[PDB]
Design an enzyme around this catalytic site. Structure first.
Site: not given
Ligand SMILES: CC(C)(C)C(=O)NCCC1CCN(c2ncnc3cc(C(N)=O)sc23)CC1
Ligand SMILES: [Zn+2]
Length: 274
Positions: A36-39, A110, A112, A129
């Site tokens: 899932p989306d982390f949020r 992503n 993953d 990222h």
């Molecule tokens: C933007 C920066 C580089 C500062 C950051 O937020 N780094 C921490 C790692 C990220 C990776 C992408 N991210 C995601 N947010 C919500 N869902 C997903 C799902 C992901 C996945 N399926 O790999 S990554 C990701 C936010 C945090």
């Protein structure tokens, strides 16, 4: 004269009139793989602080907390390391795009690593990222392939630098860090693009937001996403196409219009058997 449709994009690709495709993907393409989306309320990562022993959501991606306690991040690493989750039709669609000589570059938000696991070579990827496919000593900056710390990660040991004893951290970009060097490839890639594909993200945060406008005004932009929101909705262009709703269905509809359904099924069959 008139909106371009999904079929119109499919026809351009079939004709190889679009053969330098730049793809941008986000969290939406990996939910069908079971991430899932982390949020996401309830299911997402950021809603399981107790489960990771975290004081607050961001902490898992902050350097000062990481150096105080690397274990929560390494718990995530163990879960997200290659071999645990499977690519879905969306990842294999991009792989097919590559195999047919149509992919210029795939930009991914992503972590993953499912694009790599689907068989797209690193040279076609910009993992904006960061990635678990490589790691770096936090002290001496020695680089390591991801496989070289796999045993420690699977065994819940914090991997260490043979040279200097420093903690070896996966090449995930943490809050406040610079984006990877490979991200600067956008400078050449985007003027070169003859098709922009955006899957499972609305690219609302910078610098991804501005990149949607880096392609030339004759270049079609295809959005496959739940909603028409973000920069593409804020600043539409005459050759934009939106395929809204479920990403899996949108991708499968495009695959059919392209004539790749049987080819997709064979690829997925072969790849699952690995
Ligand atoms: C933007 C920066 C580089 C500062 C950051 O937020 N780094 C921490 C790692 C990220 C990776 C992408 N991210 C995601 N947010 C919500 N869902 C997903 C799902 C992901 C996945 N399926 O790999 S990554 C990701 C936010 C945090
Ligand atoms: Zn070192």
């Amino acid at each position: 004269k008139g909106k371009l449709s999904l079929q119109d994009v499919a026809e351009l690709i079939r004709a190889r009139a679009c053969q330098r495709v730049v793809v941008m993907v986000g969290a939406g393409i990996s939910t069908p793989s079971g991430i899932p989306d982390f949020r996401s309320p309830g299911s997402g990562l950021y809603s399981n602080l107790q489960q990771y022993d975290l004081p607050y959501p961001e902490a898992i991606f902050e350097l000062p907390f990481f150096f105080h306690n690397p274990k929560p991040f390494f718990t995530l690493a163990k879960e997200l390391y290659p071999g645990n989750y499977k690519p879905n039709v969306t990842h294999y669609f991009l792989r097919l795009l590559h195999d047919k000589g149509l992919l210029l570059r795939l930009y991914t938000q992503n972590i993953d690593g499912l694009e790599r696991v689907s068989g797209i070579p690193a040279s076609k990827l910009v993992e904006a990222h960061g990635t678990f496919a490589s790691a770096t000593c936090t002290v001496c900056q020695r680089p390591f392939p991801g496989e070289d710390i796999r045993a420690d990660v699977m065994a819940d040991r914090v991997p260490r630098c043979p040279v200097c004893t420093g903690v070896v951290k996966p090449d995930i970009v943490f809050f406040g860090e610079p984006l990877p060097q490979r991200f600067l490839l956008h400078v050449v890639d985007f003027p070169m693009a003859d098709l922009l594909l955006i899957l499972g993200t609305s690219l609302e945060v910078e610098p991804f937001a501005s990149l949607t406008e880096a392609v030339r005004s004759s270049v079609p932009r295809l959005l496959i996403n739940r909603d028409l929101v973000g920069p593409l909705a804020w600043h539409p262009r005459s050759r934009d196409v939106a395929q809204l709703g479920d990403v899996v269905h949108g991708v499968e509809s495009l695959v059919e219009l392209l004539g790749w359904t049987e080819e997709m099924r064979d690829l997925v069959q072969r790849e699952t058997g690995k």
